[PDB]
């Protein structure tokens, strides 16, 4: 059916076969085969925001069921927001072995490309795996790159990016589930992203990363 | 049955690698001037058995690679990519689930609901109805959500269009898929079509 | 490789060339065949006295092409008329290609060379021809091998042998694999021929016609009134037209869409036209009467 | 066929058989000369700045 | 690969253009609405010999308009 992808031979022209979906090069050199847990230990401290971080995107994987019952709609992404060095990295090793599920890794970054027009098709395939790879969680880094938009740029204003922007609210959004596609988002600051965004279906939970205190200091020592 | 599926191979390969034009103008019976879908600009004959009445300029044709001879006639054209936005019409979302924002709902219906059942409305007033229609609202709202969840409880046919990755770097290729949709409605009338996210165009 | 064979001179005949003719043109593109009536003379003659046509299929020229219905059928018919001829060989026609075989199409020929050795395929170019003297070759076709040793010539002794190019180093190529190009002679006379030449004995009536006097006033009208328009022209070209390049000559006096070609051209119609249309008059007014 | 296709900056035939020269065209062209054409600037005499 | 082609595209339209004074016919009629965001090699004369002028309607003639749309 059309848009399906089909070998043809180029030298005399048959239909081999039928080929099964492709997914760029560009985005499968970024994926990972899941790295070792640091888990919860190793980040020491940091309770209070370890307690939201479990309820919003753990305990639906796992116990799903119960999560019907309630009747409520999981999350379709989460957000880390509060300055660099808090443990956000360290954090999301451990959700993953939690869950046990996928953390697909994803780079803000490597969705603008160099291609045109191209690197927008990169948002739809990377969203599109993660409901292919099984439930999964996508560990966003650096979402600052993707675009803030206040555009009404009279002169440029680039726009690989603003495609990609559009393109990624587009996937959060239940044309496509967001039940199965949860986000766990780091960025460093909330300033710099716009509330297009942020929203509260979009991201659901706003969770602030405080500094150590002064006791999850000798944790972490 | 399975000698039956071999036997069509053999005719590409007899005609060595078939490809797909359109006929730009007839010239005369026999030669008609075909542009090509592949690229060059070709000059054509006819099989005796196939008529040339059949052949138009708003369809395709199909040319024997090695002698440029029209084989038989082909369907009107259309891209791959507007099949998979008609289909696309049930996205799920019921009437409930966009409550409340009921007064702008029937907003929406005098402009794309009426014309469907009854253009004759409007020309009783001596108006055309008023044409394309604008959804917007600051974010979380479900400005998406409505044009969607009418879409699907109606269940007529709408063409949904992601029209942020639509544009491409090829040069031509942005173009056709934007052109095909509108002709596209024409031809199912009546339709509607929803393009979502075309702040990017 | 050694072997002793001679090679079969086809010699058609006059009725059986226009009916390849016939079924070739009607095929396009689509590739026909059919199947060769004729005799077995000599010790390589084979003549083809008339052709039949086995079915238009899109699977043509091929096994399946040829239909044991038709076969039958004729045969039993044939019999009746009083020549129930052999099967020389078979014809078939290529319009999407030129002379070379096509790859089913040699497995096709060997079939033919299975029942008679003395079996030919002839190929038949109507819109992939670059000859009006009609593209036609004939091939026995026999293996790779005997081209490459240098035995090939050795068999086909008793031929002169041509080599013609419709399309290209890759025909040419398929050509020496296969058996080239064996002579073709032609079984013809002069009541044949006569039959060729005919057109109208409505000739007749049209020599003598002529038109209404208004119609003869229209053409003579015409011609006077285009004349005047090329004629100022015509003024420049003969106190001009030094040069004899036909490039400069062109832009310079309107050489090209010149005014002498067509001003000549011109008063010739007119001239032969009024001619024919008057002394026609005339003859049949005394005659009549 | 043609010597002075060995000549550098001469636009060339070429007929194919291996890309090979055939000869060199009579007929060449620059940008520079190109650009002054597809303008068609005005042109105007002493006359019209005159007074 | 874009950007050359739409170049191309246009040097061939100029040089097209240039060839109708020969023959009878009537060159390129276009519309600048944004002037800026368009080539001013495009708005050159020489090819161009009347430039249209619209300006805003004033009063008088906007009344009548709006009668002929109701």
């Given at each position: 059916?059309?848009?399906?992808?089909?070998?043809?031979?180029?030298?005399?022209?048959?239909?081999?076969?039928?080929l099964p979906?492709?997914?760029?090069?560009?985005?499968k050199?970024?994926?990972?085969?899941?790295?070792?847990?640091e888990?919860?230990?190793?980040?020491?401290?940091?309770?209070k925001?370890?307690?939201?971080?479990?309820?919003?995107?753990?305990?639906?994987?796992?116990?799903?069921?119960?999560?019907?019952?309630?009747?409520?709609?999981?999350?379709?992404?989460?957000?880390?927001?509060?300055?660099?060095?808090?443990?956000?990295?360290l954090?999301?090793?451990?959700?993953?072995?939690?869950?046990?599920?996928?953390?697909?890794?994803?780079?803000?970054?490597?969705?603008?490309?160099?291609?045109?027009?191209?690197?927008?098709?990169?948002?739809?395939?990377?969203?599109?795996?993660?409901?292919?790879?099984?439930?999964?969680?996508?560990?966003?880094?650096?979402?600052?790159?993707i675009?803030?938009?206040?555009?009404?740029?009279?002169k440029?204003?680039?726009?690989?990016?603003?495609?990609?922007?559009?393109?990624?609210?587009?996937?959060?959004?239940?044309?496509?589930?967001?039940?199965?596609?949860?986000?766990?988002?780091?960025?460093?600051?909330?300033?710099?992203?716009?509330?297009?965004?942020?929203?509260?279906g979009?991201?659901?939970?706003?969770?602030?990363?405080?500094?150590?205190?002064?006791?999850?200091?000798?944790?972490?020592? | 049955?399975?000698?039956?599926?071999?036997?069509?191979?053999?005719?590409?390969?007899?005609?060595?690698?078939?490809?797909?034009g359109?006929?730009?103008?007839?010239?005369?019976?026999?030669?008609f001037?075909?542009?090509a879908?592949?690229?060059?600009?070709?000059?054509?004959?006819?099989r005796?058995?196939?008529?040339?009445?059949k052949?138009?300029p708003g369809?395709?044709?199909?040319?024997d690679?090695?002698?440029?001879?029209?084989m038989?006639?082909?369907?009107?054209?259309?891209?791959?990519?507007?099949y998979?936005?008609?289909?696309?019409?049930?996205?799920?979302?019921?009437?409930?689930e966009?409550?409340?924002?009921?007064?702008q709902?029937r907003?929406?219906?005098?402009v794309?609901?009426?014309?469907?059942?009854?253009?004759?409305?409007?020309?009783?007033?001596?108006?055309?109805?008023?044409?394309?229609?604008?959804?917007?609202?600051?974010?979380?709202?479900?400005?998406?959500?409505?044009?969607?969840?009418?879409?699907?409880?109606?269940?007529?046919?709408?063409?949904?269009?992601?029209?942020?990755?639509?544009?491409?770097?090829?040069?031509?290729?942005?173009?056709?898929?934007?052109?095909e949709?509108?002709?596209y409605?024409?031809?199912?009338?009546?339709?509607?079509?929803?393009?979502?996210?075309?702040?990017?165009? | 490789?050694?072997?002793?064979?001679?090679?079969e001179?086809?010699?058609?005949?006059?009725?059986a060339?226009?009916?390849?003719?016939?079924?070739?043109?009607?095929?396009?593109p689509?590739?026909?065949?059919?199947?060769?009536?004729?005799?077995?003379?000599?010790?390589?003659?084979?003549?083809?006295?008339?052709?039949?046509?086995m079915?238009?299929?899109?699977?043509?020229?091929?096994?399946?092409?040829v239909?044991?219905?038709?076969?039958?059928?004729?045969?039993?018919?044939?019999?009746?008329?009083?020549?129930?001829?052999?099967?020389?060989?078979?014809?078939?026609?290529?319009?999407?290609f030129?002379?070379?075989?096509?790859?089913?199409?040699?497995?096709?020929?060997?079939?033919?060379?299975?029942?008679?050795?003395?079996?030919?395929?002839?190929?038949?170019?109507?819109?992939?021809?670059?000859?009006?003297?009609?593209?036609?070759?004939?091939?026995?076709?026999?293996?790779?091998?005997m081209?490459?040793?240098?035995?090939?010539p050795?068999?086909?002794?008793?031929n002169?042998?041509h080599?013609?190019?419709?399309?290209?180093?890759?025909?040419?190529?398929?050509?020496?694999?296969?058996?080239?190009?064996?002579?073709?002679?032609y079984?013809?006379?002069?009541?044949?021929?006569?039959?060729?030449?005919?057109?109208?004995?409505?000739?007749?009536?049209?020599?003598?016609?002529?038109?209404?006097?208004?119609?003869?006033?229209?053409?003579?009208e015409?011609?006077?009134?285009?004349?005047?328009?090329?004629?100022?022209?015509?003024?420049?070209?003969?106190?001009?037209?030094?040069?004899?390049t036909?490039?400069?000559?062109?832009?310079?006096?309107?050489?090209?869409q010149?005014?002498?070609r067509?001003?000549?051209?011109?008063?010739?119609?007119?001239?032969?036209?009024?001619?024919?249309?008057?002394?026609?008059?005339?003859?049949?007014?005394?005659?009549?009467? | 066929?043609?010597?002075?296709?060995?000549?550098?900056?001469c636009?060339?035939?070429?007929?194919?058989?291996?890309y090979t020269?055939?000869?060199?065209?009579?007929?060449?062209?620059?940008?520079?000369?190109?650009?002054?054409?597809?303008?068609?600037?005005?042109?105007?005499?002493?006359?019209?700045?005159?007074? | 690969?874009?950007d050359?082609?739409?170049q191309?595209?246009?040097?061939?339209?100029?040089?097209?253009?240039?060839?109708?004074?020969?023959?009878?016919?009537?060159?390129?009629?276009?519309?600048?609405?944004?002037?800026?965001?368009?080539?001013?090699?495009?708005?050159?004369?020489?090819?161009?010999?009347?430039?249209?002028?619209?300006?805003?309607?004033?009063?008088?003639?906007?009344?009548?308009?709006?009668?002929?749309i109701?």
């Open positions: 059916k059309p848009g399906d992808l089909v070998g043809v031979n180029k030298d005399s022209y048959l239909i081999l076969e039928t979906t492709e997914y760029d090069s560009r985005v050199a970024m994926e990972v085969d899941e790295r070792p847990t888990q919860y230990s190793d980040i020491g401290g940091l309770d925001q370890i307690q939201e971080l479990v309820e919003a995107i753990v305990l639906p994987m796992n116990h799903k069921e119960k999560f019907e019952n309630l009747g409520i709609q999981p999350p379709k992404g989460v957000l880390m927001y509060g300055p660099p060095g808090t443990g956000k990295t954090l999301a090793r451990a959700c993953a072995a939690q869950t046990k599920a996928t953390f697909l890794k994803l780079a803000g970054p490597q969705l603008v490309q160099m291609f045109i027009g191209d690197g927008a098709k990169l948002v739809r395939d990377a969203f599109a795996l993660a409901k292919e790879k099984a439930p999964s969680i996508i560990f966003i880094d650096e979402l600052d790159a675009g803030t938009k206040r555009f009404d740029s009279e440029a204003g680039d726009r690989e990016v603003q495609r990609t922007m559009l393109e990624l609210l587009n996937q959060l959004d239940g044309f496509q589930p967001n039940t199965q596609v949860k986000v766990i988002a780091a960025t460093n600051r909330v300033d710099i992203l716009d509330p297009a965004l942020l929203r509260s979009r991201l659901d939970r706003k969770i602030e990363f405080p500094m150590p205190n002064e006791e999850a200091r000798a944790r972490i020592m | 049955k399975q000698y039956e599926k071999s036997e069509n191979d053999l005719k590409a390969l007899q005609s060595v690698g078939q490809i797909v359109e006929v730009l103008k007839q010239l005369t019976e026999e030669k001037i075909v542009k879908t592949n690229g060059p600009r070709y000059v054509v004959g006819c005796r058995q196939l008529d040339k009445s052949l138009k369809t395709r044709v199909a040319l690679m090695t002698t440029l001879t029209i038989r006639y082909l369907p009107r054209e259309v891209d791959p990519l507007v998979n936005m008609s289909h696309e019409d049930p996205g799920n979302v019921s009437y409930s966009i409550g409340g924002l009921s007064e709902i907003e929406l219906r005098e794309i609901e009426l014309p469907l059942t009854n253009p004759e409305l409007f020309q009783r007033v001596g108006i055309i109805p008023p044409k394309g229609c604008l959804l917007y609202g600051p974010p979380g709202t479900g400005k998406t959500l409505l044009a969607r969840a009418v879409a699907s409880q109606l269940d007529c046919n709408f063409l949904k269009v992601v029209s942020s990755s639509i544009v491409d770097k090829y040069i031509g290729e942005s173009a056709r898929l934007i052109r949709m509108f002709n409605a024409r031809d199912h009338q009546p339709c509607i079509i929803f393009m979502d996210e075309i702040d990017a165009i | 490789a050694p072997a002793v064979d001679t090679a001179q086809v010699y058609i005949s006059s009725l060339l226009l009916k390849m003719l016939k079924h070739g043109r009607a095929g396009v689509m590739e026909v065949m059919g199947l060769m009536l004729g005799e077995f003379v000599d010790d390589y003659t084979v003549r083809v006295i008339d052709v039949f046509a079915p238009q299929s899109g699977t043509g020229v091929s096994v399946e092409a239909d044991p219905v038709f076969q039958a059928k004729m045969l039993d018919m044939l019999k009746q008329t009083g020549r129930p001829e052999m099967v020389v060989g078979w014809y078939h026609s290529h319009p999407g030129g002379c070379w075989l096509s790859g089913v199409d040699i497995n096709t020929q060997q079939s033919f060379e299975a029942l008679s050795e003395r079996a030919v395929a002839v190929v038949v170019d109507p819109i992939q021809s670059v000859k009006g003297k009609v593209v036609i070759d004939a091939f026995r076709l026999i293996n790779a091998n081209m490459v040793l240098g035995h090939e050795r068999q086909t002794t008793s002169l042998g080599l013609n190019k419709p399309s290209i180093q890759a025909l040419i190529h398929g050509l020496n694999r296969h058996y080239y190009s064996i002579t073709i002679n079984r013809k006379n002069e009541l044949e021929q006569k039959m060729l030449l005919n057109l109208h004995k409505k000739s007749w009536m049209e020599g003598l016609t002529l038109q209404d006097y208004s119609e003869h006033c229209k053409h003579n015409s011609v006077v009134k285009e004349m005047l328009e090329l004629a100022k022209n015509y003024n420049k070209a003969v106190e001009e037209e030094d040069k004899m036909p490039e400069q000559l062109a832009i310079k006096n309107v050489g090209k010149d005014p002498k067509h001003l000549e051209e011109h008063v010739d119609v007119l001239m032969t036209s009024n001619i024919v249309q008057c002394l026609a008059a005339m003859l049949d007014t005394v005659v009549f009467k | 066929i043609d010597i002075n296709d060995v000549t550098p900056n636009r060339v035939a070429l007929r194919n058989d291996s020269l055939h000869k060199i065209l009579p007929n060449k062209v620059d940008p520079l000369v190109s650009l002054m054409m597809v303008e068609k600037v005005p042109d105007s005499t002493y006359e019209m700045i005159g007074g | 690969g874009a050359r082609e739409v191309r595209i246009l040097l061939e339209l100029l040089n097209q253009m240039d060839g109708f004074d020969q023959n009878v016919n009537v060159k390129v009629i276009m519309a600048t609405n944004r002037a800026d965001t368009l080539d001013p090699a495009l708005l050159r004369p020489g090819r161009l010999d009347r430039k249209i002028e619209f300006p805003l309607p004033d009063r008088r003639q906007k009344r009548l308009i709006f009668s002929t109701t």
